[PDB]
Write a protein that binds this ligand. Sequence first.
Ligand SMILES: [Mg+2]
Ligand SMILES: [Mg+2]
Length: 227
Amino acid sequence: SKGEELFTGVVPILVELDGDVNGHKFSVSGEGEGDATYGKLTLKFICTTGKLPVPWPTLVTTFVQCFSRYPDHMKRHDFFKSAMPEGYVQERTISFKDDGNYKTRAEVKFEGDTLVNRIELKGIDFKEDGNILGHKLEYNYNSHNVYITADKQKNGIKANFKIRHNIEDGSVQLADHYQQNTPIGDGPVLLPDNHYLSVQSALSKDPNEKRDHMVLLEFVTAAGITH
Ligand SMILES: [Mg+2]
Ligand SMILES: [Mg+2]
Protein backbone atom coordinates (compact mmCIF):
# COMPACT_ATOMS: atom_id res chain seq x y z
CA SER A 1 0.00 0.00 0.00
CA LYS A 2 0.92 3.65 -0.38
CA GLY A 3 1.68 4.26 3.30
CA GLU A 4 3.73 1.16 4.11
CA GLU A 5 6.04 1.75 1.14
CA LEU A 6 7.19 5.03 2.70
CA PHE A 7 8.90 3.05 5.49
CA THR A 8 10.98 0.41 3.67
CA GLY A 9 14.17 2.43 4.21
CA VAL A 10 15.66 4.74 6.82
CA VAL A 11 13.41 7.75 7.40
CA PRO A 12 14.55 10.99 9.11
CA ILE A 13 12.47 11.98 12.14
CA LEU A 14 11.81 15.33 13.79
CA VAL A 15 10.03 15.76 17.13
CA GLU A 16 8.81 19.11 18.45
CA LEU A 17 7.01 19.47 21.78
CA ASP A 18 5.65 22.43 23.70
CA GLY A 19 4.69 21.67 27.28
CA ASP A 20 3.14 23.24 30.35
CA VAL A 21 3.28 21.10 33.52
CA ASN A 22 1.88 22.86 36.60
CA GLY A 23 2.72 26.19 34.93
CA HIS A 24 6.30 25.18 34.06
CA LYS A 25 6.48 25.98 30.35
CA PHE A 26 9.09 24.23 28.24
CA SER A 27 9.95 23.09 24.74
CA VAL A 28 11.88 20.12 23.35
CA SER A 29 13.29 19.51 19.87
CA GLY A 30 14.35 16.05 18.73
CA GLU A 31 16.02 14.56 15.68
CA GLY A 32 16.93 11.10 14.54
CA GLU A 33 15.82 8.36 12.23
CA GLY A 34 13.68 5.27 12.04
CA ASP A 35 14.07 1.96 10.21
CA ALA A 36 10.71 0.17 10.48
CA THR A 37 12.16 -2.86 8.67
CA TYR A 38 13.91 -3.55 11.99
CA GLY A 39 11.43 -1.79 14.27
CA LYS A 40 14.26 0.56 15.10
CA LEU A 41 14.33 4.17 16.34
CA THR A 42 17.23 6.44 17.30
CA LEU A 43 16.37 9.91 18.62
CA LYS A 44 18.14 12.71 20.48
CA PHE A 45 16.05 15.31 22.31
CA ILE A 46 17.18 18.72 23.58
CA CYS A 47 15.27 20.93 26.00
CA THR A 48 15.51 24.30 24.25
CA THR A 49 14.09 26.34 27.12
CA GLY A 50 16.72 25.37 29.71
CA LYS A 51 16.31 22.58 32.24
CA LEU A 52 13.46 20.15 31.59
CA PRO A 53 11.03 20.61 34.54
CA VAL A 54 9.93 16.94 34.50
CA PRO A 55 12.06 13.78 34.27
CA TRP A 56 13.07 12.84 30.73
CA PRO A 57 11.69 9.28 31.06
CA THR A 58 8.17 10.62 31.60
CA LEU A 59 8.19 12.04 28.03
CA VAL A 60 9.50 8.96 26.15
CA THR A 61 6.10 7.67 25.09
CA THR A 62 4.98 11.15 24.01
CA PHE A 63 8.10 11.80 21.87
CA VAL A 64 6.12 7.57 16.17
CA GLN A 65 4.59 4.10 16.16
CA CYS A 66 4.67 4.05 12.37
CA PHE A 67 8.24 2.79 12.96
CA SER A 68 7.02 -0.42 14.59
CA ARG A 69 8.01 -3.60 12.78
CA TYR A 70 4.79 -5.24 11.65
CA PRO A 71 5.57 -8.83 10.57
CA ASP A 72 4.56 -9.44 6.98
CA HIS A 73 1.63 -11.61 8.09
CA MET A 74 0.37 -8.69 10.23
CA LYS A 75 0.68 -6.00 7.52
CA ARG A 76 -3.08 -5.59 7.29
CA HIS A 77 -3.15 -4.45 10.94
CA ASP A 78 -0.69 -1.54 10.65
CA PHE A 79 -2.90 1.52 11.08
CA PHE A 80 0.04 3.83 11.67
CA LYS A 81 1.74 3.48 8.30
CA SER A 82 -1.57 3.25 6.46
CA ALA A 83 -2.42 6.83 7.52
CA MET A 84 0.75 8.17 5.87
CA PRO A 85 1.78 10.49 4.37
CA GLU A 86 -1.15 12.66 5.51
CA GLY A 87 -0.68 11.36 9.04
CA TYR A 88 -2.66 10.91 12.21
CA VAL A 89 -3.62 12.70 15.39
CA GLN A 90 -2.41 10.88 18.49
CA GLU A 91 -3.96 11.87 21.81
CA ARG A 92 -3.23 10.49 25.26
CA THR A 93 -4.00 10.83 28.91
CA ILE A 94 -1.04 9.66 30.99
CA SER A 95 -2.10 9.23 34.63
CA PHE A 96 0.77 9.11 37.11
CA LYS A 97 -0.48 7.04 40.05
CA ASP A 98 -0.93 9.19 43.18
CA ASP A 99 0.25 12.24 41.21
CA GLY A 100 -0.71 14.38 38.22
CA ASN A 101 -1.58 13.67 34.61
CA TYR A 102 -0.38 14.62 31.16
CA LYS A 103 -2.78 15.22 28.31
CA THR A 104 -1.04 15.17 24.97
CA ARG A 105 -2.21 15.98 21.47
CA ALA A 106 0.20 15.23 18.65
CA GLU A 107 0.14 15.15 14.88
CA VAL A 108 2.43 12.66 13.15
CA LYS A 109 2.85 13.16 9.41
CA PHE A 110 5.40 13.61 6.65
CA GLU A 111 6.88 16.99 5.79
CA GLY A 112 8.60 16.15 2.54
CA ASP A 113 10.50 12.94 3.24
CA THR A 114 10.78 13.61 6.98
CA LEU A 115 8.45 12.04 9.52
CA VAL A 116 7.41 14.72 12.02
CA ASN A 117 5.81 14.40 15.46
CA ARG A 118 4.45 17.77 16.71
CA ILE A 119 3.09 17.63 20.27
CA GLU A 120 1.26 19.88 22.70
CA LEU A 121 1.49 18.59 26.28
CA LYS A 122 -0.45 19.83 29.32
CA GLY A 123 0.26 18.51 32.79
CA ILE A 124 -1.83 19.31 35.86
CA ASP A 125 -2.32 18.16 39.44
CA PHE A 126 1.32 17.29 40.04
CA LYS A 127 2.68 17.25 43.57
CA GLU A 128 5.49 19.74 44.13
CA ASP A 129 7.73 17.06 45.63
CA GLY A 130 6.23 14.01 44.00
CA ASN A 131 8.30 11.76 41.80
CA ILE A 132 7.78 13.95 38.72
CA LEU A 133 8.30 17.53 39.89
CA GLY A 134 10.71 16.28 42.54
CA HIS A 135 12.86 14.51 39.90
CA LYS A 136 12.92 11.20 41.73
CA LEU A 137 12.82 8.93 38.66
CA GLU A 138 15.82 6.93 37.51
CA TYR A 139 17.23 7.71 34.08
CA ASN A 140 16.32 4.39 32.48
CA TYR A 141 13.36 2.65 30.87
CA ASN A 142 11.57 -0.69 31.11
CA SER A 143 10.14 -2.81 28.30
CA HIS A 144 6.37 -2.73 27.84
CA ASN A 145 3.51 -3.97 25.66
CA VAL A 146 1.13 -1.50 23.98
CA TYR A 147 -2.33 -3.06 23.55
CA ILE A 148 -4.06 -1.83 20.37
CA THR A 149 -7.71 -2.11 19.38
CA ALA A 150 -9.72 -0.64 16.52
CA ASP A 151 -11.77 2.56 16.97
CA LYS A 152 -14.08 2.33 13.96
CA GLN A 153 -16.23 5.42 14.55
CA LYS A 154 -13.06 7.53 14.57
CA ASN A 155 -11.65 5.61 11.57
CA GLY A 156 -8.68 4.88 13.85
CA ILE A 157 -7.33 2.98 16.85
CA LYS A 158 -7.07 3.18 20.59
CA ALA A 159 -4.51 1.76 22.96
CA ASN A 160 -4.04 1.07 26.64
CA PHE A 161 -0.87 0.24 28.51
CA LYS A 162 0.94 0.68 31.79
CA ILE A 163 4.37 2.28 31.87
CA ARG A 164 6.42 1.70 35.00
CA HIS A 165 9.10 4.27 35.77
CA ASN A 166 11.74 3.16 38.26
CA ILE A 167 12.00 5.48 41.28
CA GLU A 168 15.43 6.22 42.80
CA ASP A 169 14.41 4.41 46.01
CA GLY A 170 13.87 1.18 44.08
CA SER A 171 10.09 1.57 43.89
CA VAL A 172 8.03 2.18 40.74
CA GLN A 173 5.91 5.09 39.54
CA LEU A 174 3.05 3.79 37.41
CA ALA A 175 1.98 5.89 34.42
CA ASP A 176 -1.28 4.55 33.01
CA HIS A 177 -1.64 5.36 29.31
CA TYR A 178 -4.86 5.74 27.35
CA GLN A 179 -4.41 6.59 23.70
CA GLN A 180 -6.57 7.45 20.66
CA ASN A 181 -5.38 7.89 17.08
CA THR A 182 -7.40 9.40 14.20
CA PRO A 183 -6.24 9.75 10.57
CA ILE A 184 -5.80 13.24 9.15
CA GLY A 185 -6.10 12.44 5.45
CA ASP A 186 -8.69 10.87 3.19
CA GLY A 187 -6.89 7.73 2.08
CA PRO A 188 -8.02 4.32 3.24
CA VAL A 189 -6.60 3.33 6.60
CA LEU A 190 -6.26 -0.09 8.18
CA LEU A 191 -8.52 -0.92 11.11
CA PRO A 192 -6.64 -3.67 12.98
CA ASP A 193 -7.58 -6.75 14.87
CA ASN A 194 -6.47 -6.65 18.51
CA HIS A 195 -2.72 -6.95 18.85
CA TYR A 196 0.12 -5.38 20.77
CA LEU A 197 3.45 -3.67 20.24
CA SER A 198 6.38 -5.13 22.16
CA VAL A 199 8.68 -2.23 23.03
CA GLN A 200 12.15 -1.97 24.50
CA SER A 201 13.77 1.41 25.10
CA ALA A 202 17.26 2.43 26.21
CA LEU A 203 18.11 5.92 27.45
CA SER A 204 21.60 7.40 27.34
CA LYS A 205 23.50 10.68 27.40
CA ASP A 206 25.71 12.25 24.78
CA PRO A 207 28.95 12.81 26.74
CA ASN A 208 29.68 15.95 24.71
CA GLU A 209 26.22 17.50 25.16
CA LYS A 210 25.89 20.07 27.93
CA ARG A 211 22.29 21.05 27.19
CA ASP A 212 19.64 19.07 29.01
CA HIS A 213 18.94 16.17 26.68
CA MET A 214 18.01 12.53 26.18
CA VAL A 215 19.24 9.92 23.69
CA LEU A 216 16.73 7.14 23.00
CA LEU A 217 17.27 3.83 21.19
CA GLU A 218 14.04 1.87 20.81
CA PHE A 219 12.97 -1.37 19.16
CA VAL A 220 9.32 -2.26 18.57
CA THR A 221 7.76 -5.39 17.09
CA ALA A 222 4.04 -5.92 16.56
CA ALA A 223 2.84 -9.23 17.96
CA GLY A 224 -0.14 -11.15 19.28
CA ILE A 225 -1.47 -12.41 15.93
CA THR A 226 -0.26 -15.74 14.58
CA HIS A 227 -1.61 -15.66 11.00
MG1 LIG B 1 9.47 -5.06 4.69
MG1 LIG C 1 -11.10 -11.45 11.13
